[PDB]
Amino acid sequence: GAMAPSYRVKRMDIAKNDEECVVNAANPRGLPGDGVCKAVYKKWPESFKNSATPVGTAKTVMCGTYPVIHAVGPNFSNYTESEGDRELAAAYREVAKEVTRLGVNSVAIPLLSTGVYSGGKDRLTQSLNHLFTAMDSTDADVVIYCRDKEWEKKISEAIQMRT
Ligand SMILES: [Cl-]
Ligand SMILES: [Cl-]
Ligand SMILES: [Cl-]
Q: Tell me how far apart the alpha carbons of residues 44 and 25 are, in angstroms, rounded to a whole number.
A: 13
Helix axes 124-135, 149-161, angle to 10 degrees: 40
Distance between CA atoms of residues 38 and 42, nearest Å: 6
3-state secondary structure of 125: helix
Backbone angles phi, psi at 60, to 5 degrees: -95, 135
Q: How far is the CA of 25 from the centre of ligand 2 (A)?
A: 6
In whole angstroms, give the CA distance from residue 151 to residue 147.
8
CA 90 to centroid of ligand 3, rounded, Å: 21
Q: Which ligand is nearest to the CA of 24?
A: 2
Cβ–Cβ under 8 Å, residues 65 and 23: no
Main-chain dihedrals φ then ψ at residue 139, nearest 5 degrees? -110, 20
Tell me the CA distances in angstroms from 10 to 78, 98, 121, 155, 157, one per residue in order. Answer: 30, 22, 22, 9, 13
Taking the centre of ligand 1 as the mean of its atom positions, its distance from the CA of residue 86, in whole angstroms, is: 32
Elucidated via: X-ray
Closest to 128 (Cα-Cα) out of 105, 153, 104, 103:
153
44 CA to middle of ligand 3, Å? 21
Beta-carbon contacts of residue 154 (< 8 Å; ≥ 6 apart): 124
Residue ranges of the binding site for ADP-D-ribose: 13, 27, 35, 115-117
Resolution in angstroms, to 1 decimal, for this deposition? 1.4
